[PDB]
Design a protein around this ligand. Structure first.
Ligand SMILES: C[C@]1(C(=O)O)OC[C@H]2O[C@@H](O[C@H]3[C@H](O)[C@@H](O)[C@H](O)O[C@@H]3C(=O)O)[C@@H](O)[C@@H](O)[C@@H]2O1
Ligand SMILES: [Ca+2]
Length: 752
């Protein structure tokens, strides 16, 4: 034997779980049965005639990349079932041979070097198919003759002989070149595969373009927030290749590989909520039925488990603790239910190890400035905010996918609570895409896929504990502008809207919320203390509303409260909406089955052609009806200002004052004065100290932000970049934001 055979067997185990794959393990056996069934189902439908014109009738068309890719996937599934201990197909020679004959038929009639490397869809021809074929070759290696291996591997080398792309594509090329290298035993190619990981969009942090950013963000395709879509792919592929090579002659030696640990801590951990990977960072993949938030999260944990296998201390350990917690948290979808048998094996080992304790749940406010995203994690809930600007696109839609993604990133708020299923169970193909929670739009009117014309999108973070975001709205498809802010405190989030103006001639509205209800659509809900009808199909206007309470889809942990300072008039409707995934993902393989989900939708009508309109509401997660009423009677927050010049909210109980200044002119919000566009938050501890965080969300200020605070200080300390010019009678300092890329600068002043 040689180190190649050693590596080959290493990858094979990664695919099957290995010989020690305890078939007695409940979950393993369950997974191995689902596997064997799918294989049997395909095998029984195969056209085994030597004169066949296709492998499967439902996937015919030797030139349709979508179909060919699917054909290879099936053959891959069949191979696994034929090589996974415990499978009812393990070692079945007939299956093995039928699979190899299929590959030969495909080589002759579809996948070979006479085809164009760039024919639609190039992705299938260069990455998708090779990844499946390599896996098959590795699994049925022993039963593959030289003559056959040649046709398989020679074809892959033709389509993808090297690594030259970036981000996910580059990683996919690396794993393609790598596994083939192990198969044909090409040390040169194998080394190139290893080096591939050091390229753009992978190990090294990006300061622009595709890749992981130092602030935790992930971008793909230049302007799209993609941590949970393409980022998940880079993570999975990077983890699989690193683990494979680890300890071998071609182990990854690039020091930047430690960046990988940060992706988990900073890029993923904050965007996970009890097993779900937030959709706001999944791009057009939200329109994929097989990749709903929990299915995706399970994939990310699988990757964390893969890294735990070779990562150094104290990372391997932390990875296990994070994985454990997530697996225990997700009571919607069994983590073991949709991951590899090897993942299950390595995961059960972590979960069943009493010495490993579940990591603490994240608790913070984080500003993903590089990708116009922000997140708040608290006990019982998490709020995700998706924005867009001149740097980040509204939404992505290519290959007929995500056709209604319009407002999924235009000031859209995503609330995560104990209703783990909220965004899964066909939320995307049924929800009214024109009414994404938190957004302000021209009623029933879409917008284009692309960046905006405003750079003021981002926010400030106060020690990662609290924060505030803002977005300068101005759509290109039609006329509509506004200043939208969000202030994230401890148990509430305050959304402010000002200067909402339009000449479009289309009724303008701001969505307070749009939640998928229980199967019966009978969730109880109240307004000002009076129960509201729970019937489906009923529309109703609520006038002079101070507060609304909506009972969650779980006995507790998912209720949502809404407080309206100064009262409001809400337009609402509870209805059963029908749709199909094909409607938002028009690809041949997409299921067209109809689904029906219930929704409670609430929004503010700003009328047609409003001028300087505004709004203000507070999201009170998990509070009961009584608690919302109690809050409403003596609210913890207070709106300091809500003009097109400055939006400011104070949180009385915490001594917090947040303010978003929208212009480059001196303005004042409570104790805070700023001379330029800025996002600011202060925390005042009576007669002791005043904390302050400042950021330039535009990421375009090449000088400073001059801030003044209406308090007299004795002393201070501040992050580099900040220069204090005065402490008494008032606090004055400037913030050097040239090249800050939307980061927050902190300062703490000793009052006295
Ligand atoms: C298996 C699957 C799928 O989910 O259907 O096949 C299609 C493949 O598309 C990938 O995105 C490609 C896109 O298809 C292609 O037209 C261009 O390049 C994109 C890329 O950056 O990889 C990615 O979206 C990738 O996730 C996706 O995987
Ligand atoms: Ca509070």
């Amino acid at each position: 034997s040689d180190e190649f055979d050693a590596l080959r067997i290493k990858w094979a185990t990664l695919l099957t779980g290995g010989p020690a794959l305890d078939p007695a393990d409940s979950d393993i056996a369950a997974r191995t049965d689902k596997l064997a069934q799918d294989a049997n189902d395909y095998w029984e439908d195969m056209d085994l005639s030597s004169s066949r014109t296709y492998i499967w009738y439902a996937l015919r068309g030797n030139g349709t990349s979508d179909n060919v890719n699917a054909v290879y996937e099936r053959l891959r599934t069949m191979a696994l079932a034929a090589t996974t201990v415990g499978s009812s197909l393990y070692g079945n020679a007939d299956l093995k041979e039928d699979i190899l004959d299929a590959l030969d038929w495909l080589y002759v009639n579809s996948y070979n070097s006479t085809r164009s490397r760039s024919a639609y869809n190039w992705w299938h021809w260069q990455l998708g198919i090779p990844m499946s074929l390599n896996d098959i070759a590795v699994l049925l290696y022993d039963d593959i003759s030289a003559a056959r291996m040649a046709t398989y591997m020679d074809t892959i080398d033709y389509f993808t002989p090297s690594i030259g792309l970036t981000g996910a594509a580059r990683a996919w090329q690396a794993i393609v070149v790598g596994v083939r290298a192990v198969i044909v035993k090409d040390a040169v190619k194998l080394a190139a595969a290893r080096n591939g990981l050091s390229g753009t969009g992978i190990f090294p942090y990006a300061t622009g373009g595709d890749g992981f950013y130092a602030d935790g963000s992930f971008v793909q395709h230049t302007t799209f927030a993609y941590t949970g879509g393409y980022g998940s792919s880079v993570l999975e592929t990077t983890a699989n290749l690193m683990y494979l090579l680890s300890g071998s002659t071609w182990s990854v030696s690039d020091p930047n590989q430690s960046n990988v640990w940060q992706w988990i801590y900073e890029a993923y951990r904050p965007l996970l909520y009890k097993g779900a990977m937030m959709d706001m960072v999944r791009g057009r993949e939200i329109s994929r039925s097989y990749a709903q938030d929990h299915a995706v999260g399970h994939g990310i944990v699988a990757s964390i488990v893969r890294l735990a296998q070779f990562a150094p201390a104290p990372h391997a350990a932390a990875f296990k603790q994070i994985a454990k917690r997530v697996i225990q948290e997700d009571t919607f979808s069994s983590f073991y239910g949709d991951v590899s048998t090897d993942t299950i094996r390595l995961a059960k080992a972590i979960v069943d190890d009493p010495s490993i304790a579940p990591a603490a749940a994240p608790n913070l406010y984080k500003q993903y400035a590089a990708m116009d995203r922000a997140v708040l994690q608290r006990p019982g809930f998490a709020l995700g905010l998706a924005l867009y600007s001149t740097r980040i696109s509204s939404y992505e839609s290519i290959n007929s996918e995500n056709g209604r993604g319009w407002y999924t990133g235009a000031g859209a708020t995503y609330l995560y609570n104990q209703d783990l299923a909220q965004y899964s169970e066909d939320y995307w193909p049924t929800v009214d895409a024109y009414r994404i929670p938190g957004t302000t739009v021209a009623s029933g009117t879409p917008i284009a896929s692309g960046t905006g014309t405003s750079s003021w999108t981002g926010g400030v973070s106060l020690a990662g504990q609290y924060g505030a975001s803002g977005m300068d709205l101005s759509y290109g498809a039609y006329n509509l502008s506004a200043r939208k802010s969000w202030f994230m405190f401890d148990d509430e989030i305050v959304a402010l809207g000002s200067g909402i103006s339009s000449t479009a001639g289309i009724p303008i509205e701001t969505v307070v919320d749009n939640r998928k209800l229980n199967g019966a659509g009978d969730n109880a809900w109240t307004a000002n203390g009076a129960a509201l009808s729970t019937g489906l199909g009923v529309a109703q206007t609520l006038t002079g509303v101070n507060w609304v309470h909506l009972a969650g889809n779980t006995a507790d942990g998912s209720d949502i409260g809404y407080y309206f300072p100064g009262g409001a008039t809400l337009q609402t409707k509870r209805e059963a909406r029908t749709g199909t995934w094909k409607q938002i993902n028009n690809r041949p393989a997409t299921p067209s089955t109809a689904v029906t989900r219930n929704y409670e939708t609430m929004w503010i009508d700003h009328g047609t052609n409003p001028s300087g309109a505004s709004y203000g509401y507070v999201l009170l997660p998990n509070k009961t009806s009584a608690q919302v009423g109690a809050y409403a009677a003596d609210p913890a927050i207070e709106i300091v200002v809500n003009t097109s010049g400055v939006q400011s909210v104070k949180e009385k109980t915490l001594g917090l004052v947040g303010a978003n200044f929208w212009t480059d002119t001196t303005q004042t919000a409570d104790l805070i004065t700023s001379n330029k566009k800025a996002s600011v938050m202060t925390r005042e501890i009576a007669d002791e100290r005043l904390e302050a965080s400042v950021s330039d969300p535009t990421q375009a200020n090449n000088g400073t932000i001059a801030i003044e605070l209406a308090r007299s200080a004795e002393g201070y300390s501040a992050d580099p970049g900040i220069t204090v010019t005065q402490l008494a009678p008032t606090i004055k300092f400037t913030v050097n934001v040239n090249g800050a890329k939307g980061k927050s600068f902190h300062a703490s002043f000793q009052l006295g």
